[PDB]
Subunit: 62 residues, 6 copies
């Protein structure tokens, strides 16, 4: 199920950990996980931006 993905993202969100989100094309976005659902992650770095999970390679604490 989502027994890894949801607790991993929730912890980053709860703890306001700065993250790097690497996209599948190698572009690295930085910010905080504001929220997420089945399909998207909202990545906040003053501005809120919506990232499709389909375009993400990895999520790592910065």
């Amino acid at each position: 199920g989502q027994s890894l993905q949801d607790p991993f993202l929730n912890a980053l969100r709860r703890e306001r950990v700065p993250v790097s989100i690497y996209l599948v094309n190698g572009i690295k976005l930085q910010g905080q996980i504001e929220s997420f659902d089945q399909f998207v992650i909202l990545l906040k770095n003053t501005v809120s931006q919506m990232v499709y999970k389909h375009a993400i390679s990895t999520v790592v604490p910065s």
Copy 2:
């Protein structure tokens, strides 16, 4: 759950937006409408963007 309100808020306030595609290309315009699979992005003309091709949507 979060996708629709995020896109709608941009449409509602006519926020100029950037849509970055999975291949790195940046498209700019206004969110005119959206459904399960697509976003209509308006500039001079309305073009239909497939969600599967999008990496991010962000105010410009």
Copy 3:
């Protein structure tokens, strides 16, 4: 749907379109027909394009 009426209008009105693919290649032609997964695009040839390979459909 926003997608289906958009494609149907383009198809019925025989509107010249540009289809941009995920590899950056631009196809041009008229939308001859479409279904859940594919679009039939006609120019000098008649070609079945998978929607998963499309980024955008733009009136030319």
Copy 4:
């Protein structure tokens, strides 16, 4: 539904039309449609090769 895709491919198969299959990375394969199902197309050009539909951009008569 598959009201376009299945009759398009079946006609190519039935009529033994030489086809070009462009992959999503721009590589062009050539051969005849031997058969297909939900996920793959078998492309025959003396040898039978299995092509995942997820990797295909377009199918066109050659």
Copy 5:
């Protein structure tokens, strides 16, 4: 319907194969096993290839 028998025939006859990935990379070895989502390709070691990453499977 066609995928499983195609892969199995290659495994059964120990046919040396090429698996071409969506990014153009060619992997070579023997089909050792497969399930809904992956193919195990054996050379010196067995590596697990995700089907979503594969364009084609062909005898080498």
Copy 6:
């Protein structure tokens, strides 16, 4: 499943692995955990990798 036993063996035996991504980048580490959609890979950092971005998992 062939996938789950393969990943589980790698995880339990703390086998160093190379994960090749769709963009050609090679990650290295140990499989800390996995579920339907993601793998947690640990090296000097602990990183959640989406399976859709992975081409292969190779014992290093």
